[PDB]
Design a protein around this ligand. Sequence first.
Ligand SMILES: CC(C)[C@@H](NC(=O)[C@H](CS)NC(=O)CCC[C@H](N)C(=O)O)C(=O)O
Ligand SMILES: [Fe+3]
Length: 329
Amino acid sequence: SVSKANVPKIDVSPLFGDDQAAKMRVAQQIDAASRDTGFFYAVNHGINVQRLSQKTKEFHMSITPEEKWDLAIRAYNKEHQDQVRAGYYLSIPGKKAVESFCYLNPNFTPDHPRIQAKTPTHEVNVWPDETKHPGFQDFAEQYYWDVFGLSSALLKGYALALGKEENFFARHFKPDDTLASVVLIRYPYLDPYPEAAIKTAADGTKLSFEWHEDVSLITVLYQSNVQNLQVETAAGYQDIEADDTGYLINCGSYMAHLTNNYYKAPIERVKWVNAERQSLPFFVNLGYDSVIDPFDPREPNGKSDREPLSYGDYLQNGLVSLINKNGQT
Ligand SMILES: CC(C)[C@@H](NC(=O)[C@H](CS)NC(=O)CCC[C@H](N)C(=O)O)C(=O)O
Ligand SMILES: [Fe+3]
């Protein structure tokens, strides 16, 4: 028997406005959700998620093996030593079902001083041929900024929820240096589905991806309408209901650190489902040198002894660890 997680739907539209009290009522809901299962669905968010899913689908179903190699990250193509994060993540028929395409801040160009300095976790995006994928780069870049704008508003809600001024997080979330990423993930329908691509949890559940905590400040996730996600609670894993009009939001482990675990990063996993579906996370990362001073909302004086963590160092450590624990995606 598996229970269902309480994932409230929160109308986030006041966070784009100037009704301060209405923004506090949103913040209260974010607070409650963050202290309960850790998840909520952001609704009335203003993003055209039908176009997002449509363009994503066109890309996944039309890219060829030749293009995948040409775009592949270093884990699949030794020629691409600079592509640790951005690029195509190939499936392995018979062994690995999932495939995906990751891109970063469009402002990371050869002109960018972080690229000039070769700072870790910064890369220039790679893209397919425009004539073979008309409109795809423009769509993807536009979506990055559309979801950046939503995430900025959500971060105002999280700041208010923790008793802070509304820019406490968002001031560090900037288009010129954000390390945030979009991943366009395809989960395919396969018949027969390779058992090699299915993992079995301790509790016997068949999984496509084992338990993990997000490496992010927050995670802003769109998925098609196929239930798959679960969140761990003390009483076991609970199913997260699907909603292909909303964004599923949760705090990442950077948030857990800076709030002294008041807003924990939920432990989540992906059930195996033999169904064609899409999973499109936006990982809200800050700048490489962004440092948020920890605090403890449980203490009268709000004082935490936790060390201020530079975000870039945090991101580098978290992404290599996630690969080491749950395998190369
Ligand atoms: C909804 C999630 C569980 C989704 N998985 C994911 O988002 C996966 C596994 S946790 N994410 C990652 O591994 C981290 C990707 C980070 C990205 N390459 C970058 O350099 O910024 C899924 O649907 O599999
Ligand atoms: Fe996740």
